Ligand binder design. Structure first.
Ligand SMILES: NC(=O)c1ccc[n+]([C@@H]2O[C@H](CO)[C@@H](O)[C@H]2O)c1
Length: 359
């Protein structure tokens, strides 16, 4: 009984890559004028949304979540694959459309209104109203501002962040990850970089884990490393998904960093046993900028020594995963300080404005 109730039904179309407040204002007006609204997400393989990593199936799921607390609003999918390109696609297209209306509606003798943004769709739809006992009307709505907003969001999400629907925000987020040995100032750097622009940041999970479970670096076993992989990943996703996210988040280490420690300190067998979880987790990471603190002259007591060992292995692995074009090495102390170098790198890779201190 997950069908739309009522007699006056509005049909609202979009690709929704992403959904934004322009859509939402129109939808809620439409829902105030009708007994219920059917949102139609249209798409096809390798369409505009698919090309930026938002294929039809994902936009449909995101919309369902976005409208998960609405009485009279249903979300449905119009799959446009395998259509004859010319005229005979219009018949089949409409068939699928009216099938969607039939399946997702409770009652009969409806009064249905299509909200349509292109003159071609209106004319083709008006010729193909079926004799199903419903009354149909097509209403032209101006979509120019909505389409332009969508285009501007895709070009520069950080400039239009507050208008992006929250379910879509993770996809468009910029992500800066800091990497380095223990006791090199990562945590101080992360917090200063993030606080400089009101961005959220994560903490190094390994430090929390060793305090909560009260164990030293040299007591870590294979299973601790596994828990640090998922623990750091969850902490990082939490910040990317945080409502405090304004478009840029800072991460204090990641699975690659943990993979460097594992490679250096675990027995070969135990490392090889963690490799699938490493690969899975590293594959789920999205990084735009990787800041590496190189070795120059609560404490991780064993992780302190052999900094150059850690750094060489880290650089090997960043090459192994093809990340070198996102890596900036903070070899200062040219810029005044490590912090000057990093905040400038943040500027170049995210677009955010940074104030000067001096003339
Ligand atoms: N670097 C990260 O840990 C990171 C960055 C962006 C997103 N995520 C998570 O992965 C998923 C997307 O693949 C999202 O659900 C994020 O939580 C993790």
């Amino acid at each position: 009984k997950s069908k739309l109730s009522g007699k006056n039904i509005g049909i609202y179309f979009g690709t929704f890559a992403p959904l934004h407040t322009g859509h939402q204002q129109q939808i809620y007006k439409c829902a105030s004028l009708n007994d219920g609204v059917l949102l139609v997400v249209s798409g096809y393989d390798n369409d505009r949304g698919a090309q930026i990593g938002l294929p039809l199936e994902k936009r449909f799921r995101y919309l369902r979540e976005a409208f998960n607390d609405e009485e009279n609003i249903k979300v449905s999918m119009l799959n446009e694959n395998d259509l004859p390109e010319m005229p005979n696609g219009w018949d089949e297209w409409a068939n699928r459309l009216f099938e969607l209306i039939h399946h997702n509606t409770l009652e009969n003798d409806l009064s249905v209104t299509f909200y349509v943004g292109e003159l071609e769709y209106a004319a083709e739809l008006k010729k193909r109203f079926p004799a199903d006992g419903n009354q149909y009307a097509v209403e032209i709505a101006d979509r120019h501002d909505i389409s332009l907003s969508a285009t501007q969001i895709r070009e520069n999400p950080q400039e239009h962040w507050t208008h992006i629907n929250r379910v879509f925000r993770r996809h468009f987020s910029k992500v800066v990850t800091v990497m380095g040995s223990a006791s090199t100032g990562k945590t101080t750097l992360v917090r200063r970089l993030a606080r400089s622009i009101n961005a959220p940041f994560s903490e190094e999970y390994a430090r929390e884990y060793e305090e909560a479970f009260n164990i030293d670096d040299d007591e870590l076993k294979m299973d601790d490393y596994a828990r640090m992989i998922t623990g750091q990943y969850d902490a990082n996703s939490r910040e990317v998904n945080s409502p405090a996210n304004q478009g840029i988040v800072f991460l204090d280490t990641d699975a690659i960093v943990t993979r460097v420690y594992a490679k250096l300190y675990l027995p070969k067998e135990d490392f090889e046993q963690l490799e699938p979880l490493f690969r899975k987790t590293i594959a789920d990471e999205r990084m735009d900028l990787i800041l590496v603190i190189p070795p120059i002259t609560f404490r991780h007591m064993e992780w302190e020594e052999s900094r150059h060992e850690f750094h060489e292995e880290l650089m090997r692995q960043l090459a192994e995963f093809g990340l070198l074009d996102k890596v900036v090495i903070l070899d200062d102390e040219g810029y005044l300080t490590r912090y000057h170098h990093a905040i400038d790198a943040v500027h170049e890779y995210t677009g955010v404005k940074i104030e000067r201190l001096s003339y």
